[PDB]
Amino acid sequence: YRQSSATSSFGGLGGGSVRFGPGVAFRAPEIHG
Known part of the structure; x- marks a missing residue:
């Protein structure tokens, strides 16, 4: 779920x-930029 946040x-x-x-x-997986 996407939280409204500040x-x-x-x-x-x-x-x-x-x-x-x-x-x-989905949970953010270990990725590289």
């Missing part, structure tokens, strides 16, 4: 829902 603007105090593009939510 932001300049927000819907309200409650977490509510976050609108994100279609895909899957």
Whole structure:
């Protein structure tokens, strides 16, 4: 799940829902840049 986290603007105090593009939510694996 994508957390709203700190932001300049927000819907309200409650977490509510976050609108994100279609895909899957997986833990970030060990990757290299």
